[PDB]
Design a protein around this nucleic acid. Structure first.
Lengths: 189, 50, 79, 298
DNA sequence: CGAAGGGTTACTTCGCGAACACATGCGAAAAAAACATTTTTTTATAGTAGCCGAAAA
DNA sequence: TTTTCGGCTACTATAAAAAAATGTTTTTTTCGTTCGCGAAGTAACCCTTCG
């Protein structure tokens, strides 16, 4: 629509040199009175027709769901035979659903079936294909507890060293300010 | 600005016609003789002289 | 002359103290949201009187240009 | 950024103490117009801003920190790094909230969300003044100025230091235990009061140097002069230079405790003006014209 | 003989009235503090926002 | 190609003691239509006096 209706990106930046120019380029800062002057920008882009619609009755929270896939159900029974009641891992194992709706799915599947769930808790399968799916479909690194623990310890040590260096720099600045105050008292008399 | 409007007097149809078409002023309460009280000869057809 | 005498009286004065060292041009202001406005064209013809000036020379010999070309224009006008 | 090598040129020219001569050299190296254009671009790439003075152009100020980044603390808005740059150059003490309200003519709740979003990453490390007229706070670092050796020293160790310097000058400019009783006080004071007759003359700061607690008690002979002014307007005379003369109220309210017991020597003269002791009038007893006379709510 | 100490008349600016009846402490940045939300554990229960299939042509 | 009537999804409400992370309304410092007459601040000019 910017191509259709209409440089065009006339905005500001994090610094004061905004435009065109940063200042005058003839002899000195000439356009500093104009560079020192946000609300004048490009907005005539998104035009849409009107209506007199409504959203009443009940608006706000809710749940947009569907009749569930039977292949998703087979994957859920294989998962509960492989890696059980692990709400966060189950929400991550289906990474386009959400959290409260799969909790309603937990209580719904806890309702109707004792046999395959009892055989699932009988099974005790080791979690390798679950990590395979979680590392392919998400492309997450999953660094182990030694590497992640060492990285967290290194970050904590870097933060403690930065805090100690800031405290030492503040003490040195306070000592320099006390020396400057003593020098000003010596120069006042 | 005080005294802009007035309740509509209906003593007669002449009252309802003559309270309209009325030229109120700014010199409302001031005891000055022969100033903005005596009518001027530039009123022939402009305003009523009686 | 009058601005020169006031500047010479404002020369070597001790009233511009050490504020002249820490002069910053960081005073960029937002656009005039409904509080009070800028100059904005009311004195732009009064403001632009020192920004530029051209040195235009004398004429002293010009006879042909704005006299004969005017008659040559009538040769192509033709009513 | 990564425009060209002129970022490295700006670092090399901003390494040391710079002035307008550095920009003279920077315009002196290559051809002038392309240098001015690319230097305007580099100054538009979040670098040093020029200064309008009697001289042409100055740097801001001497260092090559280059930390604003314009998009990344938690969110993205081109208003926060502006306010951070406003509180970079606050100066000695800091900046007001009304001053940052006066500049940029913005709202106050955007200043409050700047406060929160910059306090989330420790750049609003403030220094508090003794008084709070308009919240002179929110400087950069280190709590540097403190307007505070005796000003922010309230209240208990001002009284403790006052008591111990009163004790030391009372034991220096007068002998130690001859103020307790009247059995020959001070022995024809200081042995026929001639040329001995001395005082401290920087010895009081030596006695302070004998014992401190090391928080604010390194006084460069000016807080000692402030306490000197605090003591000669109540109970010291201090003839011209440094001779204190603690007396005429030290003896009474120093030796009232365990030095002036009951069954004394002689009854006192009526209405001794230089005396605050034994003045009571009522268990309840305020019937008639007892000492209820003073000022009577005129 | 000339500079200085009262001493008054002269120009200019600030306080009241005009009839006599009738019947119509306030505002505006923040700051210590007592406090609720917001959970998640169900969970009984109706239906009310939104969603496709068996029914008629 | 059009409509209608039955299956699922499920969130509100009260009640429970459970306890933690985080956000929510009042205070104490400072300030932008006469005219006439009678009476009270600043100047122009004499009477008198010392260096």
């Amino acid at each position: 629509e910017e191509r259709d209706k209409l440089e065009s990106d006339r905005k500001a930046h994090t610094a004061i040199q905004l435009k065109g120019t940063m200042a005058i380029d003839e002899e000195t800062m000439v356009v500093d009175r104009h560079k020192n002057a946000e609300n004048e920008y490009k907005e005539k882009v998104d035009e849409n027709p009107f209506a007199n619609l409504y959203n009443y009755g009940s608006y706000g929270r809710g749940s947009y769901t569907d009749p569930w896939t039977v292949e998703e159900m087979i994957k859920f029974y294989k998962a509960l035979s492989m890696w059980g009641t692990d709400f966060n891992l189950i929400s991550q194992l289906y990474p386009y659903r959400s959290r409260k709706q799969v909790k309603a799915k937990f209580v719904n599947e806890e309702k109707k079936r004792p046999i395959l769930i009892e055989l699932a808790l009988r099974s005790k399968l080791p979690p390798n294909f679950d990590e395979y799916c979680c590392e392919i479909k998400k492309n997450i690194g999953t660094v182990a507890d030694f590497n992640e623990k060492l990285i967290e310890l290194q970050n904590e040590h870097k933060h403690h060293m930065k805090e100690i260096e800031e405290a030492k720099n503040t003490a040195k600045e306070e000592d320099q300010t006390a020396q400057r105050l003593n020098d000003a008292n010596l120069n006042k008399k | 600005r005080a005294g802009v409007t007035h309740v509509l007097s209906r003593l007669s149809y002449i009252s309802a016609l003559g309270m309209m078409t009325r030229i109120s002023s700014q010199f409302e309460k001031s005891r000055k003789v022969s100033g903005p009280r005596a009518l001027q000869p530039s009123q022939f057809g402009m305003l009523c002289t009686a | 002359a009058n601005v020169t005498r006031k500047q010479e009286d404002a020369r070597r004065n001790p009233n511009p103290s050490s504020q002249r060292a820490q002069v910053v041009t960081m005073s960029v202001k937002s656009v005039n949201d409904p509080s009070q406005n800028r100059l904005t064209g009311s004195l732009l013809a009064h403001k632009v009187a020192d920004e530029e000036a051209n040195i235009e020379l004398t004429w002293a010999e010009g006879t042909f240009e704005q006299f004969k070309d005017t008659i040559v224009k009538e040769a192509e006008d033709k009513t | 950024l990564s425009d060209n090598a002129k970022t490295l040129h700006s670092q090399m020219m901003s390494k040391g103490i710079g002035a307008l001569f550095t920009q003279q050299e920077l315009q002196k190296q290559m051809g002038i117009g392309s240098l001015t254009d690319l230097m305007s671009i580099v100054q538009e790439l979040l670098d040093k801003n020029l200064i309008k003075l009697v001289k042409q152009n100055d740097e801001l100020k001497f260092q090559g920190v280059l930390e604003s980044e314009a998009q990344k603390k938690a969110t993205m808005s081109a208003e926060e790094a502006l306010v951070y740059s406003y509180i970079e150059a606050s100066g000695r003490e800091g900046i007001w909230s009304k001053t940052i309200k006066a500049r940029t003519n913005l709202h106050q709740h955007v200043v409050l969300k700047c406060l929160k979003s910059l306090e989330s990453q420790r750049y609003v490390k403030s220094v508090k003044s003794v008084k709070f007229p308009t919240r002179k706070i929110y400087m950069l670092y280190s709590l540097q100025p403190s307007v505070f050796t005796d000003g922010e020293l309230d209240i208990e160790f001002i009284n403790s230091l006052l008591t111990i310097v009163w004790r030391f000058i009372s034991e220096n400019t007068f002998p130690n235990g001859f103020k307790n009783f009247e059995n020959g006080p001070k022995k024809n004071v200081f042995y026929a009061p001639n040329v001995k007759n001395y005082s401290t003359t920087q010895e009081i700061l030596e006695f302070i140097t004998a014992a401190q607690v090391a928080n604010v008690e390194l006084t460069p002979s000016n807080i000692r002069s402030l306490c000197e002014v605090l003591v000669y307007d109540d109970k010291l005379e201090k003839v011209t230079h440094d001779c204190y003369r603690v007396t005429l109220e030290s003896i009474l309210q120093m030796n009232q405790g365990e030095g002036e017991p009951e069954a004394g020597n002689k009854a006192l003269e009526d209405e001794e003006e230089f005396s605050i002791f034994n003045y009571f009038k009522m268990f309840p007893a305020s019937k008639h014209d007892k000492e209820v006379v003073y000022f009577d709510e005129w």
